[PDB]
Design a protein around this ligand. Sequence first.
Ligand SMILES: Cc1ncc(COP(=O)(O)O)c(CN[C@@H](CO)C(=O)O)c1O
Ligand SMILES: Cc1ncc(COP(=O)(O)O)c(CN[C@@H](CO)C(=O)O)c1O
Ligand code: NA
Ligand code: NA
Lengths: 385, 388
Amino acid sequence: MWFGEFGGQYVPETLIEPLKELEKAYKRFKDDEEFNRQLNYYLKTWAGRPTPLYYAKRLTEKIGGAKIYLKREDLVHGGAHKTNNAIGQALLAKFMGKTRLIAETGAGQHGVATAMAGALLGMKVDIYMGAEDVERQKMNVFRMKLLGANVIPVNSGSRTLKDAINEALRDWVATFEYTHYLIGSVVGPHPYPTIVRDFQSVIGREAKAQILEAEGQLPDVIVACVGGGSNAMGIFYPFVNDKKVKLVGVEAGGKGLESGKHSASLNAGQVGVFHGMLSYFLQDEEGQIKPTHSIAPGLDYPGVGPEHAYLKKIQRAEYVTVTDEEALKAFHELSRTEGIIPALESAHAVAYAMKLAKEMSRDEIIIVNLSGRGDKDLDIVLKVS
Amino acid sequence: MWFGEFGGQYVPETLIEPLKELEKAYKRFKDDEEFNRQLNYYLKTWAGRPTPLYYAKRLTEKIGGAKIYLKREDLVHGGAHKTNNAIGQALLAKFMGKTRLIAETGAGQHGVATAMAGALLGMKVDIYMGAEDVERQKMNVFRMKLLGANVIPVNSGSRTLKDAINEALRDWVATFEYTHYLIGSVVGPHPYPTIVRDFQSVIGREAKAQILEAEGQLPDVIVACVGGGSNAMGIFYPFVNDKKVKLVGVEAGGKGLESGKHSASLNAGQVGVFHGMLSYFLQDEEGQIKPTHSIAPGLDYPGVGPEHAYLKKIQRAEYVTVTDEEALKAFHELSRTEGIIPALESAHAVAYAMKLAKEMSRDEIIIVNLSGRGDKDLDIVLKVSGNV
Ligand SMILES: Cc1ncc(COP(=O)(O)O)c(CN[C@@H](CO)C(=O)O)c1O
Ligand SMILES: Cc1ncc(COP(=O)(O)O)c(CN[C@@H](CO)C(=O)O)c1O
Ligand code: NA
Ligand code: NA
């Protein structure tokens, strides 16, 4: 329920029944032999797990400090980590007898992943997406439809990610007998922050195994970008009890923190209650939720997961920011130097890892979670660069 | 050098030295333990091999005949099988002491693969691309640029793939001491068609272990699309000596064979000599290479590799065609039924397998090589199928 003070389940009474059924089903299926056989079978033969851990030798040499390894979630079916959680939850939904999935999306990547998993298991899929975001993600919207999903543009409020979540929640309240709301990050009311993190943890368990094989030891640092915080919790969580391993989450600095055009909830947001949870949110002087900005469309959620707020508060992980300009420089550098075109979200983690490696010893190890590939971001990079 | 009467090395004398050195080097390194340790290393940690073999149960059941498995080359780094050969040849180049790679590309996929492998290995990269292909493939051109490669638009001739290969050959003549010409299909003068097949063979070796593991037996049929022939050679070759296993190559039927707008060299071309090889080409009465058509950008080469001409000749493999319309329907169908968006090239193989499956027993097994993912093809599909 809670991570320290954060998280919880602060929702109208109409949400209580769906959430308790979900928790009950999850408790029942998460260790069910049959459910796991099927989940691993799809993650293996359809998504292509495990993903490799890649030693970025040229990058490491050029910077001339710590060894930089990349956990290659860009190679997952779909092009991003989102797929791990979409498969997990869609299968859960199927085991509970649901026939339809809904999900919110901002950048379109979780919408695409959800559509994919829906098509895979033969469920109807409706994706709520703010109309401002539908307009900026033309090709992800088209992918979703090719996959047989319907895209419902959300015209209420600020027409953006928070608003799509709101409508998704209203729908679920009416339709949960046959619908599962497939939340895309480690946010929302219990049990979603736990479920999503459980379904992303596969990343860290692979990465731990792979780095022991490659180097005979655990990494000195793991670096991941933080929107809502799923890919970061995914790779962090299996290392939480390893005292040697530093954990660094990188948030969107946008045009700079001072500019007020960014998406850095942990660094510059306030603690508050929204979307059924107590965590950090970016809000105005009136207290209402504030619009975010980043060149990375996936770093758009105006809050962060509670388990991160918790890891911050107990100082188990550190949270930093990287600006638009720095992320873009990193997108280019990784492309030219290692022949890997990263997602612009993931480029934030790369840029921070680049700065940190420089200060570190050649004997030390950084693992960078490469949350996604950059194909989806080409139009954006074309326009700016 | 020869696959029955097909193949050879039909080049001006200037190119004999480069091809000689390459042949020497490939023989040396093909079995070098260090070369192979490094190659396997990059294929695993950077390219993401092995790719899985996926049972399309929903597709299979909807069609109600044979089981359809998909070899998922769409999951390889870069999104197509091209990467396997690109890494192989770029490594070979680097072991030969070369510092520059050149390549030709039509669809742009091999250009991208070449740029990626050159970036990986710290080599300079120039890609030749017909100006008409450049215009149709802005995003792949942009990808190549981002990867640090230089794209050279070819304005001579038809301004298309054949012309890019001609320009690449002239470059290599002048620059072979330090440059390697990274040919992207099982085509060109010996030793290229052997080498590329050898480097794509991993696909079939995987698929073979994976199917024994999933089903305890070999497939009844393997279906792959055929442009130049590399993805098909890759998956066919380790099964050639398994009498049981049918091999089916699928060529682009375009607007239909009777229309003359297609790219079916084996089905409707002639024996000819271009690009240093004796094989089947689409060429007119005055011996000139014809323009090709397909909705799939990567099925644009106006010929086919000599090893395919050989298999057709001895009847080890059958070669069919699928139209644009059939390929498009299959593209939509795989996306909707299995949540996998295929490349339009690979959709030709899928469309054929769907037809074959219908005519087969539920006991039987078809492996389809899914040569690439459809991300690169979304603008084409948007334009042709329309928005939804
Ligand atoms: C490739 C990639 N990397 C990182 C993130 C950030 O989210 P996370 O912090 O849950 O991992 C996203 C989020 N993308 C979400 C929010 O916009 C989506 O709806 O698509 C992403 O698509
Ligand atoms: C995804 C995909 N699948 C199949 C093929 C056909 O080539 P093959 O028959 O050599 O495998 C191509 C070729 N594409 C070549 C020729 O245009 C290129 O230069 O990119 C492809 O890109
Ligand atoms: Na945020
Ligand atoms: Na052809």
